[PDB]
């Protein structure tokens with residue numbers, strides 16, 4: 001029998017609320033990743049199979065005290081089938097869990113974490129964001145957060161916006177969300193309507209698996225959405241989040257800066273610049289998120305062989321592109 005369990009929404013939902021989760025836990029409702037529950041029943045590893053190589057999405061979910069156990073069991077179970085195990089988008093404070101198994105780390109980027117309490121558009125340099133907000137407020141756009149269950153009529157209106165936003169592009173997966181009705185029923189959906197009540201944009205609000213932190217997964221808008229649409233949505237989102245009592249917002253991962261000062265090869269360099277599309281949501285520009293003055297939280301790739309790092313990145317990139325062969 002193949003390693004891991006079939007993705008089960010009911011079991012996952014029960015687990016994430018009774019044991020807790022992380023930033024990438026909600027992505028398990030896409031049904032495109034296999035699950036590996038620990039024998040303790042307190043920890044969970046989500047992953048995807050690519051040939052003889054398994055790619056884990058993030059750190060384990062659940063009780064952190066069972067994290068060494070689930071990693072031990074998962075790696076052992078993969079040792080039997082002779083599979084290579086890769087960990088994608090883990091955090092620094094959990095490096096000790098993987099270092100003992102001889103894993104190396106590579107910084108993929110940083111997540112923009114915006115303080116909702118100290119965020120404002122009243123700043124002297126915040127004249128740009130305040131102008132965008134005022135214009136949307138002037139033209140009569142309204143922001144609303146809807147709760148599941150959602151009707152077909154509502155989903156149809158979201159699909160029209162989504163399809164128009166996608167264009168000729170197809171959906172990505174694994175570490176990114178896509179338009180699935182089952183998945184969309186699992187969380188609140190925030191919409192932006194015009195004066196005529198026409199939905200021109202939508203976002204799905206991702207569950208609190210931390211302190212007072214929230215985030216979104218999908219952010220899509222139609223062609224009739226005004227310029228600065230993405231900036232406007234985050235402003236409305238931050239306003240709503242602060243109103244609900246949330247402390248922080250995760251704007252998703254952004255590419256690293258040029259550091260400022262080598263293990264760099266031409267192989268690795270070409271792969272990374274090719275990759276700048278599949279790992280950074282909303283905008284591939286770090287400056288887009290940086291202007292919100294966020295606290296950067298690094299995400300790392302856990303690998304074993306350094307010479308196989310360029311290939312590893314390609315396999316993960318294609319996995320996000322929904323191809324495993």
Ligand SMILES: NC(=O)[C@@H](N)CCCC[NH3+]
Pocket residue numbers: 169170171172176177178217218219220281282
């Ligand atoms: N999951 C997301 O961030 C979606 N808003 C876009 C994914 C497909 C991009 N071509």
